[PDB]
Ligand binder design. Structure first.
Ligand SMILES: CN[C@@H]1CCc2c(ccc(O)c2O)[C@H]1O
Lengths: 288, 54, 233, 333
């Protein structure tokens, strides 16, 4: 009813504020202090920038849409907003994948890690990640390759007051794969290998110092790292692939709810990837 | 043996010296600081026009 | 005028040279050879080689740099060895009955306690080499001074349940070896908080595989540091 | 040994009788300098590892720094440029100095050798001029009396006066029980004091070669030493949190600088041009600025990720640059 719309608007505003505050704080902490400027922190700030961009562009206009129930802006702005949304989501997820790969190289090959990661190499990796994210979002959306030949879709593309997402099978499959499924496989293999390394280190320590007093922590950290990424985004891409095949109908509300559940992952990320004592000290110095 | 004699002689050399009262020394330090306070860029804020680093 | 351009060009050339030096320096590890005198540090150093003494050895295309210092009990230069990859501690395990007045092994334990609890050497792992195993075995196996006579805690000591012996060993020599090892490990475990560990090794002058042991210990040290940094350990 | 104890008792009694009133009592009416706020004007980047020593040039524009990377970099403070970058034979370096003529740069450390680099040479940009050997310990600090004479303080508990042209020790100074960790020259260069780990600062006469006075003060080691600009006083930096000011003529401490919160050690001590401010580094990441005549903290210098190991005030008193273990040189004003 009337109260429900106000509640949804309040929740959306709170989510916007949380995402903006968290990512702005992370970026400011990384920028202000030269101590925090580290090769892995370049990936961290790339992820933070992607999350800030999404929470500033896609989330507020999406909330305005869901509350207003119509798109007031022009037909060009609908396509631009959709492209920005896809670009931000893809960039964030592939940056998570890159952070995971960096950790894999750090633990798996400790000697060679310090040599084959450099500031120039990190900048090249970040630029390549953003270019890959852009080609998946801007190139198909702007050149109308994502548009599908359906009666409802064709009607929607005509009237400028309606801005929804209707996509063809090919672009949907390709975007879902590139954005989420390849990063999922890479991250799973990475974190399985890193868990194996942490485990074997634990039994080596136990063998060395068993009698004296000196994998719960590793399991908890891996859960907090990967589970929140899997839980937030997996349902959305699953229902994407499902309704695109259209073998099982998916309601629009079910789609939007899962998409916003994926959106809040950007706000969740700073609490997962910025728990270091250095980051905590920087945050404490910045505010109070 | 020989080290003890050297240490004793060294202590004897330092013992024979003239020491002025601490009041005079404190007055000298205060006078030096007061006299040279006008030419200390660190103590008083130098103008940004004359500051070389800014 | 031209002075600014000359300074810019000189700074650019120096910056490029320093970038190359940065790559070369970060690609090479550093170790500290710290140990009591006459404990075999020279022999073990020559084994790795294959005012200060600097020897560079590489294994598996990884460059290791070792520095051995040579003058009093007080150590203020020890603050200069922060951020080293590992501190290699060679001790004469055979010297349980010697005058160094004081037992040499007890002096080595005091040195280990001083190094472990030093504020500057915190987060630095120590690779421990119990050198001169053969002399210790010869002493303990033959009739000689009892460990209990010099170390009172040896009387109540027993072989640990791990009991990992070599291919050929005696119960008495194994008991003495493990007691000496757990003395150092007991000194190590209490003060540590998981940042730095102690790696014990029983080595002899005959053995020549210490390169592999040092390489594996350094690999484990860096892996554990990386794992604890990310909070997975 | 009985005569030595009697002499020490007589010296202590004479010092106690000479002390009429503490410097704190006399400086009561002096107005405080007030709060001092200092900002990092320029930050110097390029050092690979932690920095121990620094020295400001006589031109008040050029400074040289030493790091464990083996690079001895000469910076242009005004333009934030690298004038020179000198490699070193030994990676471990604990000291550096810059000659008053601006042509020579001294270096040393765990290598047990003081090395002098000729900046005036044109056939080679930078090269070793002399390999001054004879010390059996690490060189804690080196300073230049002139373009040809240099004094070093090593871990052999001895300070020595070297002659660069000949390359051998002209004179050696003995008497310290522990390692010598710092050294500073008086403005007239005829005298200098060296702090030691023996919890005692000794004053030496260069020409005579004989120790003149010894100040006990605190009980921990002395890491930092520096004369007053007048030349009749100096301050020490202890491993304990106390910084103390001694007077040569009164032959006793005048005032001690300490705070309840501070428990860390001191690594570097220098005076302002007028001597009103005693800028002292700390094992804590932040630096401190003390009012010399009143023992009242004026300002705090912060912004270093690691401990501050170097500090210096330029000749004209325009700027202060502190070199910390964070491999960064920050110039304050
Ligand atoms: C408008 N919402 C979009 C629609 C499709 C899509 C999203 C995110 C990542 C992708 O790879 C996509 O293909 C969603 O945020």
């Amino acid at each position: 009813d009337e109260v429900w719309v106000v509640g949804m608007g309040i929740v959306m505003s709170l989510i916007v504020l949380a995402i903006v505050f968290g990512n702005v704080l992370v970026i400011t902490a990384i920028a202000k202090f030269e101590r925090l400027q580290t090769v892995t922190n370049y990936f961290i700030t790339s992820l933070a920038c992607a999350d800030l961009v999404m929470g500033l562009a896609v989330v507020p206009f999406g909330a305005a849409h869901i509350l207003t129930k119509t798109w007031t802006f022009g037909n060009f702005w609908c396509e631009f907003w959709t492209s920005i949304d896809v670009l931000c989501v893809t960039a964030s997820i592939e940056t998570l994948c890159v952070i995971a790969v960096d950790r894999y190289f750090a633990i798996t090959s400790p000697f060679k890690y310090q040599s084959l990661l450099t500031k120039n190499k990190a900048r090249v990796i970040i630029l390549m990640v953003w270019i890959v994210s852009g080609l998946t979002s801007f190139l198909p959306i702007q050149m109308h390759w994502y548009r599908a030949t359906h009666q409802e879709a064709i009607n929607c593309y005509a009237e400028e007051t309606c801005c929804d997402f209707f996509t063809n099978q090919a672009y949907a499959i390709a975007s879902s794969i590139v954005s989420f499924y390849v990063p999922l496989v890479i991250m799973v293999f990475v974190y399985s290998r890193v868990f194996q390394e942490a485990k074997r280190q634990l039994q080596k320590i136990d063998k060395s110092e068993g009698r004296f007093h000196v994998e719960h922590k590793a399991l908890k950290t891996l859960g907090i790292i990967m589970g929140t990424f899997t839980l937030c985004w997996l349902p959305f891409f699953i229902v994407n692939i499902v309704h695109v095949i259209q073998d099982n109908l998916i309601r629009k509300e079910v789609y939007i709810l899962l998409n916003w559940i994926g959106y809040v992952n950007s706000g969740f990320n700073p609490l997962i990837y910025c728990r270091s004592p250095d980051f905590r000290i920087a945050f404490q110095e910045l505010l109070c | 043996i020989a080290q003890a004699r050297k240490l004793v002689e060294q202590l004897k050399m330092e013992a024979n010296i003239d020491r002025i009262k601490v009041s005079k020394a404190a007055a000298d330090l205060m006078a030096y600081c007061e006299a040279h306070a006008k030419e200390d860029p660190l103590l008083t804020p130098v103008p940004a026009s004359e500051n070389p680093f800014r | 005028r031209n002075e600014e351009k000359a300074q810019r060009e000189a700074n650019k050339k120096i910056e490029k040279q320093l970038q190359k030096d940065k790559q070369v320096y970060r690609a090479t590890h550093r170790l500290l050879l710290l140990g009591a005198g006459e404990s075999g540090k020279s022999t073990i150093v020559k084994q790795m080689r294959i005012g200060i003494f600097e020897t560079k050895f590489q294994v598996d295309k990884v460059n290791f740099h070792m520095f051995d210092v040579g003058r009093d009990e007080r150590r203020k230069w020890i603050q200069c060895f922060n951020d080293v990859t590992a501190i290699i501690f060679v001790v004469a395990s055979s010297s349980y009955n010697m005058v160094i007045q004081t037992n040499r092994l007890q002096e080595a334990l005091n040195l280990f306690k001083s190094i472990w609890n030093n504020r500057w050497l915190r987060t630095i792992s120590v690779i421990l080499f119990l050198n001169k195993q053969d002399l210790l075995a010869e002493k303990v196996l033959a009739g000689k001074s009892k460990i209990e006579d010099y170390f009172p805690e040896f009387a109540r000591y027993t072989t640990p349940e791990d009991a990992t012996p070599e291919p050929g060993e005696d119960p008495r020599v194994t008991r003495a070896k493990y007691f000496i090892r757990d003395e150092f490990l007991r000194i190590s475990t209490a003060s540590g908080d998981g940042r730095h560990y102690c790696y014990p090794h029983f080595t002899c002058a005959v053995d020549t595989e210490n390169i592999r042991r040092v390489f594996n210990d350094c690999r484990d040290i860096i892996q554990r540091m990386h794992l604890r940094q990310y909070e997975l350990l | 040994r009985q005569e030595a104890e009697q002499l020490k008792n007589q010296i202590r009694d004479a010092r106690k009788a000479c002390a009429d009133a503490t410097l704190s009592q006399i400086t009561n009416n002096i107005d405080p300098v007030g709060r001092i706020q200092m900002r990092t004007r320029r930050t110097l980047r390029g050092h690979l590892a932690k920095i121990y020593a620094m020295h400001w040039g006589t031109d008040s524009r050029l400074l040289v720094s030493a790091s464990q990377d083996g690079k001895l970099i000469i910076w242009d403070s005004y333009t934030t440029n690298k004038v020179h970058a000198i490699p070193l034979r030994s990676s471990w370096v604990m000291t550096c100095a810059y000659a008053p003529s601006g042509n020579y740069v001294a270096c040393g450390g765990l290598d047990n050798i003081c090395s002098i680099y000729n900046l005036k040479t044109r056939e080679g940009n930078v090269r070793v001029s002399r390999e001054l050997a004879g010390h059996t310990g690490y060189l804690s600090c080196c300073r230049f009396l002139d373009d040809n004479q240099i004094v070093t303080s090593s871990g052999d508990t001895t300070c020595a006066l070297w002659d660069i042209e000949t390359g051998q020790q002209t004179t050696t100074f003995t008497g310290h029980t522990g390692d010598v960790m710092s050294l500073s020259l008086a403005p007239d260069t005829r005298l200098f004091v060296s702090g030691a780990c023996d919890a005692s600062a000794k004053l030496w006469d260069v020409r005579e070669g004989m120790c003149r006075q010894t100040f006990t003060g605190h009980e921990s080691d002395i890491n930092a030493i520096c004369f007053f600009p007048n030349g009749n006083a100096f301050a020490t930096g202890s491993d304990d949190a106390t910084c103390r000011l001694f007077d040569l003529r009164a032959d006793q401490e005048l005032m001690t600088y300490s705070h309840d919160n501070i428990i860390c050690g001191i690594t570097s001590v220098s005076f302002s041009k007028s001597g009103r401010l005693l800028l002292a580094g700390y094992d804590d990441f932040n630096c401190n600025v003390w009012d010399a005549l009143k023992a009242d903290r004026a300002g705090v210098l912060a912004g270093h990720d690691n401990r501050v190991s170097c500090l210096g005030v330029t000749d004209d008193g325009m700027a202060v640059a502190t070199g910390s273990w964070d491999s960064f040189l920050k110039i304050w004003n």
